[PDB]
Coordinates of C-alpha atoms and ligand atoms in Angstrom, one line a residue:
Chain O
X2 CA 0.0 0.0 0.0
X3 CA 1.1 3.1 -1.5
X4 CA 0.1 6.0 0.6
X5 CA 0.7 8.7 -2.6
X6 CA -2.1 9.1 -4.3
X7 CA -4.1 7.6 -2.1
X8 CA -7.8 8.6 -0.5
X9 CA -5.8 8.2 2.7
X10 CA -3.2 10.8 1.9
X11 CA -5.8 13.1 0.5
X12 CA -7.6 12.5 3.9
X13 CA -4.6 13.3 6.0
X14 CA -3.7 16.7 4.5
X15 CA -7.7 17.8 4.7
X16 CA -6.9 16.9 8.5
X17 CA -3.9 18.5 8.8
X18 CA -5.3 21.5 7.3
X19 CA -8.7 21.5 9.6
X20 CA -6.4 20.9 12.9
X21 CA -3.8 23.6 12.0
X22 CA -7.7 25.7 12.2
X23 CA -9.2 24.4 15.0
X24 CA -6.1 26.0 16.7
X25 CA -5.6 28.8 15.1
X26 CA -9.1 29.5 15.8
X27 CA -9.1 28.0 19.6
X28 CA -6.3 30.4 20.9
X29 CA -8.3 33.2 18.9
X30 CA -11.3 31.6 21.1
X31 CA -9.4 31.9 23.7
X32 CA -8.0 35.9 23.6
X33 CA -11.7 36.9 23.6
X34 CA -12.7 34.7 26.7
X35 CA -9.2 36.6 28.2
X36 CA -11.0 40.1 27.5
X37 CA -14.0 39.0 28.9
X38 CA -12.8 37.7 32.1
X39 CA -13.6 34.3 31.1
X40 CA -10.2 32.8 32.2
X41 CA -11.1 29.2 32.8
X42 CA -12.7 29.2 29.5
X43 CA -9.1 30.8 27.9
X44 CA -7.2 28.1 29.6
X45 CA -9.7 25.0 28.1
X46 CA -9.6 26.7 24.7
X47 CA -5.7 27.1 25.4
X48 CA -4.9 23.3 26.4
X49 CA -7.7 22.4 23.7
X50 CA -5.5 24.0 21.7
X51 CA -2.2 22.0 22.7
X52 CA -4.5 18.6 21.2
X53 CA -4.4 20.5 18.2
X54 CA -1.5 20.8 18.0
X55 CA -0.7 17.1 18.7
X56 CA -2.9 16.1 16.0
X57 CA -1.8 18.1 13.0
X58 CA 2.1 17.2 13.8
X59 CA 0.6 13.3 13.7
X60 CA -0.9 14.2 10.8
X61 CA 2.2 16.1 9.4
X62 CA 5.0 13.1 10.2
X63 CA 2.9 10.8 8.2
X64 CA 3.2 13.2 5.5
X65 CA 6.8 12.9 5.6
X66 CA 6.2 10.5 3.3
X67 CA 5.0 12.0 0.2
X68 CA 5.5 15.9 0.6
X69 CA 5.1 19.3 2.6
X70 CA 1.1 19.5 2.2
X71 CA 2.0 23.1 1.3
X72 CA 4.4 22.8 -1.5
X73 CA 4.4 19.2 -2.5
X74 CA 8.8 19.6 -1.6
X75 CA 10.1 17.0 0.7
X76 CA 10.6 17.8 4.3
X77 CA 12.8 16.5 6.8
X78 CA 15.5 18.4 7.6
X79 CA 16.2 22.1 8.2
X80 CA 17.8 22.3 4.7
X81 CA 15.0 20.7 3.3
X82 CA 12.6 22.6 5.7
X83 CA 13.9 26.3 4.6
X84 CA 13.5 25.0 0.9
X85 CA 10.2 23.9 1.1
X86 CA 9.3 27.0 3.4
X87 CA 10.9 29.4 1.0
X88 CA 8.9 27.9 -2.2
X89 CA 5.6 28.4 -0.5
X90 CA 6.5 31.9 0.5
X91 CA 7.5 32.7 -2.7
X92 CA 4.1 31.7 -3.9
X93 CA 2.4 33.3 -1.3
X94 CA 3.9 36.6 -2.4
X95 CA 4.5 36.0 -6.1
X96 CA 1.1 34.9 -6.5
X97 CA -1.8 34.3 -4.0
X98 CA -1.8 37.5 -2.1
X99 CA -1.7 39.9 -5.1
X100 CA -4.1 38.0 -6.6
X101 CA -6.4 38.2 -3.7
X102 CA -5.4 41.6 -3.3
X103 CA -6.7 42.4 -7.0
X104 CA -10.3 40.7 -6.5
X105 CA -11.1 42.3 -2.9
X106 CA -10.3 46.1 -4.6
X107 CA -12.2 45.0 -7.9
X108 CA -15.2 43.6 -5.5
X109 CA -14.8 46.7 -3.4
X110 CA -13.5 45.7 -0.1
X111 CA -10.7 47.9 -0.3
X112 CA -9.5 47.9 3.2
X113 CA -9.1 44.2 3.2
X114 CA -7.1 44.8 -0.2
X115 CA -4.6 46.8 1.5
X116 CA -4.4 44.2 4.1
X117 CA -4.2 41.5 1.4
X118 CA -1.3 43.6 0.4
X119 CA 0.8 44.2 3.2
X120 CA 0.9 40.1 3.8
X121 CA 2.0 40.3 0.7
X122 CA 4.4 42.3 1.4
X123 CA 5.4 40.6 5.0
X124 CA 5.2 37.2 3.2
X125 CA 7.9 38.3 1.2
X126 CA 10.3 39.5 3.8
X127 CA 9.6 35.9 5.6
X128 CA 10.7 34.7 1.8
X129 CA 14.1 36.9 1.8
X130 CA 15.0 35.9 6.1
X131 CA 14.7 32.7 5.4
X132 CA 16.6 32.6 2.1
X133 CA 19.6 34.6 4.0
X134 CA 18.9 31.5 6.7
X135 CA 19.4 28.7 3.9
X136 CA 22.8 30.5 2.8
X137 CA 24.2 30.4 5.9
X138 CA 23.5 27.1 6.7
X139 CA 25.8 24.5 7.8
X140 CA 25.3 21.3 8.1
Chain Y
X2 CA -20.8 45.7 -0.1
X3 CA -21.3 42.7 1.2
X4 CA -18.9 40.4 1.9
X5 CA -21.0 37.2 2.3
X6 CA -21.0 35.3 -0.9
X7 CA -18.2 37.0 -2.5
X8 CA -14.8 35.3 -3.9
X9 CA -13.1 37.8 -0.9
X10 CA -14.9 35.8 1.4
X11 CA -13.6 32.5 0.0
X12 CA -10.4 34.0 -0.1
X13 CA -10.2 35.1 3.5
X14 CA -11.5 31.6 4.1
X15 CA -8.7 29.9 2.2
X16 CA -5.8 32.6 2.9
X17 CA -6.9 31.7 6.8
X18 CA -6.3 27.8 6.1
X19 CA -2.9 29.1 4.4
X20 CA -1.7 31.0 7.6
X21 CA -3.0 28.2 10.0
X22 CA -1.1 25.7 8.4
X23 CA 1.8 27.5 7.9
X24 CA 2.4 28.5 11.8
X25 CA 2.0 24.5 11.8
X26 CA 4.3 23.6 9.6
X27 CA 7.1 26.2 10.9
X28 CA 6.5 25.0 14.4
X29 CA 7.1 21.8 13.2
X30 CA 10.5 22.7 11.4
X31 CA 11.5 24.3 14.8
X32 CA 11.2 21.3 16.3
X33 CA 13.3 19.4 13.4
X34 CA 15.9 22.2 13.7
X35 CA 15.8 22.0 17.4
X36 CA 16.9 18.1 17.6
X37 CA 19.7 19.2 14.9
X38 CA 21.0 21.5 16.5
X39 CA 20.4 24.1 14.2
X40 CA 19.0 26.8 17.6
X41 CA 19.4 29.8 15.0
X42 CA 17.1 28.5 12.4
X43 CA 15.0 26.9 15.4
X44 CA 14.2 30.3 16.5
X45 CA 13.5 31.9 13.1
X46 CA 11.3 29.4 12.3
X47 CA 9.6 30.5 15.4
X48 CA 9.6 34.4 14.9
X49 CA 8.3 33.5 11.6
X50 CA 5.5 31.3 12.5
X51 CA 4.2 34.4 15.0
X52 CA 3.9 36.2 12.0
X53 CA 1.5 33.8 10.5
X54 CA -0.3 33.8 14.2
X55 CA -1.0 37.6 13.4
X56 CA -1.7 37.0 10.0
X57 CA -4.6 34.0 10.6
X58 CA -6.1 36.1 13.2
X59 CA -6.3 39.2 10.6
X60 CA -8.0 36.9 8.4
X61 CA -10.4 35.7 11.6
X62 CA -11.1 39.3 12.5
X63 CA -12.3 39.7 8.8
X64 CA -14.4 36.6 9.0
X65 CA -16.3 37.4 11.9
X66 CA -18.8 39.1 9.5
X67 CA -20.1 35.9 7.7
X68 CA -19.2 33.0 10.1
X69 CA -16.5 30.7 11.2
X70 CA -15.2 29.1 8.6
X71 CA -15.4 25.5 10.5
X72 CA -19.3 25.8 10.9
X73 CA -20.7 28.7 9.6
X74 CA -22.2 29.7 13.0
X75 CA -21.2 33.7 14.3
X76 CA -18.6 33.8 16.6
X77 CA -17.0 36.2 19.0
X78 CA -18.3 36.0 22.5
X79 CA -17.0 32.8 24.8
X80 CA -20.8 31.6 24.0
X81 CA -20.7 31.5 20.6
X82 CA -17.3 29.8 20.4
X83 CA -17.6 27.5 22.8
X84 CA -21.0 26.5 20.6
X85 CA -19.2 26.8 17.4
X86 CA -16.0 24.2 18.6
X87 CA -19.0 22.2 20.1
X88 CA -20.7 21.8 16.5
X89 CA -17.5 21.4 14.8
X90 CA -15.7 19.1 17.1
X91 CA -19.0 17.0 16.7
X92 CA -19.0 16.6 13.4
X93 CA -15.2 15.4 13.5
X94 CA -15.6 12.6 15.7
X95 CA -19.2 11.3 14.6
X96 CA -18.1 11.5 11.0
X97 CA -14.7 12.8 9.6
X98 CA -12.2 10.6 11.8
X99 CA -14.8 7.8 12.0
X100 CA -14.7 7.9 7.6
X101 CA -11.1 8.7 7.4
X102 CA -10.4 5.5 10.0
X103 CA -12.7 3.5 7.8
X104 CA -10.8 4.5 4.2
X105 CA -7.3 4.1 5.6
X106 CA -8.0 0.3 6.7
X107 CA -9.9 -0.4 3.5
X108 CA -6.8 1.2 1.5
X109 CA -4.5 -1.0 4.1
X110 CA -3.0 1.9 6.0
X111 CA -3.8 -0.2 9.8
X112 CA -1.8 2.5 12.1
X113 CA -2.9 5.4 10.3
X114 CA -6.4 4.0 10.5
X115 CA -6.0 3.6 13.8
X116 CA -4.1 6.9 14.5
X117 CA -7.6 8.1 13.0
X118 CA -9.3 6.0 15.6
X119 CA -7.3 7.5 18.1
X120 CA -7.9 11.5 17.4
X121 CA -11.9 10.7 17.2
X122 CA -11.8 9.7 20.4
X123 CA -10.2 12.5 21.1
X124 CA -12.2 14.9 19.5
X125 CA -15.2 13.7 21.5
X126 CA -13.7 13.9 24.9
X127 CA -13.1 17.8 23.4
X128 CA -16.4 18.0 22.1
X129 CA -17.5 16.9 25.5
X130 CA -15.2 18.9 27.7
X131 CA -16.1 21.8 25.8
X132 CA -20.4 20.9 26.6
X133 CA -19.3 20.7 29.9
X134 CA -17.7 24.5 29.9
X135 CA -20.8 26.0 28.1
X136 CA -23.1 24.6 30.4
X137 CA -20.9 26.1 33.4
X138 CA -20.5 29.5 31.8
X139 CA -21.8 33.1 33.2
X140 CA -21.8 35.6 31.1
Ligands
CO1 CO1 -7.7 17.5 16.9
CO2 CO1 5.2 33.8 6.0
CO3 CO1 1.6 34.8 6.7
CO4 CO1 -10.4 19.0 19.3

């Protein structure tokens, strides 16, 4: 059994994608329970969160396997890990954030544009640091 | 105009998994670089994933308008997240682990089926932890 091109595969990077969410969005959860006052809800969104986080690195070293769900690049180590991170970068700033900047001005949301735009722009210093990291590398 | 409906809103929604995974990933790299020794790419890898943190919680901020992008349902206060992880924690351990467990045995992928097994169980101890904290809540 194969695990690239597989349902299975497909079915681990959907996971890895939704628990990377759930706690993203539990530790955002959890900074509006800390406004509120709702501290032991914060701390069960906060440890909730640490599951999370469990899960989509189980998810992620199965991947190892066939490819950074991000890039399709192998991962591994940090050579192989700045590589991959630099590609998807690159097309973050090259490509998807421009683009999405372009339709939210053309569909009138033009605050959201600019924001669109300065990831752009922050995506792409992220690209440059961790190209300067690769270079210096030694291992 | 109105951000329901429009490709923005996809966008946001996509641009939001993007930014989620990527803190993932980096954190994941860090953890690769740490056992390698490599402490200075460890730490940029970790400086860079806060920047996606900021970034997927830009994107959240954006998305409170239409819904969270797990469930559709508004969120915001502690008692609409805590209902919104409720719904969406439900749906992963009645159906998506359950399905994934089911495909990844059927494909012949035994651990990750049960590793699949493993994280709905999980899910509904969250999903029931979670209940537990709603039902408790004073607001
Ligand atoms: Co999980
Ligand atoms: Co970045
Ligand atoms: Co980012
Ligand atoms: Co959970």
């Amino acid at each position: 059994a194969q695990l690239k091109g597989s349902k299975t595969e497909e079915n681990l990077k959907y996971a890895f994608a939704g628990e990377s969410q759930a706690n993203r969005r539990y530790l955002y959860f959890a900074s509006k329970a800390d406004v509120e006052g709702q501290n032991d809800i914060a701390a069960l969104f906060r440890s909730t969160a640490e599951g999370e986080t469990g899960h989509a690195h189980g998810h992620l070293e199965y991947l190892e396997a066939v490819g950074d769900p991000a890039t399709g690049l192998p991962f591994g180590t940090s050579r192989q890990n700045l590589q991959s991170a630099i590609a998807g970068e690159t097309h973050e700033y090259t490509d998807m954030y421009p683009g999405m900047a372009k339709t939210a001005r053309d569909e009138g949301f033009e605050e959201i544009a600019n924001w669109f735009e300065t990831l752009a722009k922050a995506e792409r210093s992220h690209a440059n640091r961790y190209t300067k990291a690769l270079d210096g590398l030694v291992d």
